[PDB]
Design a protein around this ligand. Sequence first.
Ligand SMILES: [Co+2]
Ligand SMILES: [Co+2]
Ligand SMILES: [Co+2]
Ligand SMILES: [Co+2]
Ligand code: NI
Ligand code: NI
Ligand code: NI
Ligand code: NI
Lengths: 107, 107, 102, 102
Amino acid sequence: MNLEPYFESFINNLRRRVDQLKSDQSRLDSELKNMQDMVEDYRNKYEDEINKRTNAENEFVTIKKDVDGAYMTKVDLQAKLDNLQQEIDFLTALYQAELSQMQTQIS
Amino acid sequence: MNLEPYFESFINNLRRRVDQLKSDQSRLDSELKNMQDMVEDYRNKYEDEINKRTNAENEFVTIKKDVDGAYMTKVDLQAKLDNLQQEIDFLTALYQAELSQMQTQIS
Amino acid sequence: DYSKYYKTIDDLKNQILNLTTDNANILLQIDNARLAADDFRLKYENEVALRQSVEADINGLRRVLDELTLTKADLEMQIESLTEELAYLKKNHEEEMKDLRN
Amino acid sequence: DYSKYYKTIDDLKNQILNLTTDNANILLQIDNARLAADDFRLKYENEVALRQSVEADINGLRRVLDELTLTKADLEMQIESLTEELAYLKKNHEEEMKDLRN
Ligand SMILES: [Co+2]
Ligand SMILES: [Co+2]
Ligand SMILES: [Co+2]
Ligand SMILES: [Co+2]
Ligand code: NI
Ligand code: NI
Ligand code: NI
Ligand code: NI
């Protein structure tokens, strides 16, 4: 008979396709592992950075509390100054009037 | 004596300051309430919109699952076509060889 | 009496201080309210823009699913025409054998 | 024998199908991996940009706290000079009374 040689030809073409598919596989294994390494990197950058942002949130809250308090004081004190000065002006003109009155008073 | 008129003057100036402070207060009451109304608005826009985004996340996951499956099939079927066609070509040339051999065979 | 004028003035001083501080407190309530807003705002802006991005990527997925099922269907029909071509070649050989038995 | 060549060919067909599907599966693992990345990326970008914004607003708060304590100190010193001016006016009046007793 004489069937094989053509069988052999076709099998060789086949073994070609399988060889390519194995090489492809390996490559995709590597690219996958590399993408996983990257995924874990990005995940860590994320987690780490939400810890960073949250501790910054807290630092902010504290400084803002200090500011709020200090505005409270400043307006309190400024108001008390306004009181003292206004009282000064008043008392000056008054005391001038006190001397004026005592003086022109029947002894 | 004659102390009052100056007292009265200063008290009137004072009553001026207090009147202004009361008006200010009222205004700040209103602006605060308005800012709270706005705060609740922005909070609701937020909450509502994270529900919106999350249900969109789910819709996405589902469609992507369907796509993944369908790629899986397509490559499976395409591969099976590749098989059938390759087998065709092979079988044609072979059968030509089968007739060639049968023919030139000692009867 | 002189003293009574004094007493009023003092009462009124204390009122000014109470009202001044009270106003200040309210204002601080406002500033902190603004800030809280701004936080919720930025947070919402980012949530929205995200929802949008995901929905658009979804538009992409729709497009590729549509074309993909088109290609699927096409291939299926070609598998039918090819399974056919196969069978017909089988029969050809069978008839050649019918010649052998002759 | 003829049949054995057939048997190999079939084994090898099945291998191609197993390897083709296996590759496809891996690829899908990759695409989904890329996507998961992109999610974590955008999420991180927004977390960072936020941290930055809050720290800069903190810079603002530092500036206003600094100037604010400066103003506080200034006012305090002025309260001292004014409480002084008050006391001195009191004494002036007292001496006027020392004239009355004369
Ligand atoms: Co492997
Ligand atoms: Co009120
Ligand atoms: Co009060
Ligand atoms: Co397998
Ligand atoms: Ni904020
Ligand atoms: Ni054809
Ligand atoms: Ni995504
Ligand atoms: Ni002066």
